[PDB]
């Protein structure tokens, strides 16, 4: 119990400001730099078909829930050294919370 739900609305704007550049959340939404994330929760890293995920991703083989997703979010390259994810992360717990709640919601 190390993840508390923040604001959906809050999350929706970091997502825009911080993940839209390379990602879509919507089912039937496109793969871009990074892959579309619809249905990310419960799935293991590297399973979006039509996306050329680095070796690193695949082998990591992380299960996607709110928690894993918060450390990863703290420092990706650190959670998965190898990852072509060019993102330093999100330093604050609160901001993390917010977006995941956001992610929680839309990728559904
Ligand atoms: C482009 C500059 C990106 C930004 C900004 C963000 N993401 Fe990303 N993401 C990107 C790539 C190229 C990849 C694949 C990495 C690889 O090594 O192949 C990823 C991957 C993810 C994943 C894991 C994918 C999976 O197994 O299905 C997740 C959960 C994810 N990205 C989420 C995410 C969020 C919430 C972001 C905003 C703060 C974000 N990423 C930024 C490309 C880019």
- Residue 69, annotated as binding a ligand: no
Q: Where are the domains of the chain?
A: 1-108
Backbone dihedral region for residue 61 (phi beyond 0: left; psi -120 to 50: alpha; all else: beta): left
C-alpha 15/C-alpha 49 separation (Å) is 22
Helices (H), the chain: 8-18, 55-60, 68-74, 76-79, 93-106
Atom in ligand 1 nearest the alpha carbon of residue 86: 2
Q: What is the resolution of this structure in A?
A: 1.9
- Residue 19, annotated as binding a ligand: yes
C-alpha 24/C-alpha 34 separation (Å) is 9
The CATH number assigned to the domain with range 1-108 reads 1.10.760.10
Most ligand 1 atoms within 8 A of CB, residue of 21, 34, 98 to mutate: 34
- Could you tell me if 89 and 76 are in contact, meaning their C-beta atoms sit under 8 angstroms apart? yes
Q: How far is the CA of 58 from the centre of ligand 1 (A)?
A: 13
Beta bridge partners of 96: none
Pick from 86, 79, 77, 104: which is nearest to 9 by CA? 104
């Amino acid at each position: 119990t190390e993840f508390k739900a923040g604001s959906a609305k809050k999350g929706a704007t970091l997502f825009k400001t911080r993940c839209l550049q390379c990602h879509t959340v919507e089912k039937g939404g496109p793969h871009k730099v990074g892959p579309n994330l619809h249905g990310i929760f419960g799935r293991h890293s590297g399973q979006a078909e039509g996306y050329s995920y680095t070796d690193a991703n695949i082998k990591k083989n992380v299960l996607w829930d709110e928690n894993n997703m918060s450390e990863y979010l703290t420092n990706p390259k650190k959670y998965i050294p190898g990852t072509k994810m060019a993102f330093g992360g999100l330093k604050k717990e609160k901001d993390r919370n917010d977006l995941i709640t956001y992610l929680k919601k839309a990728t559904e």
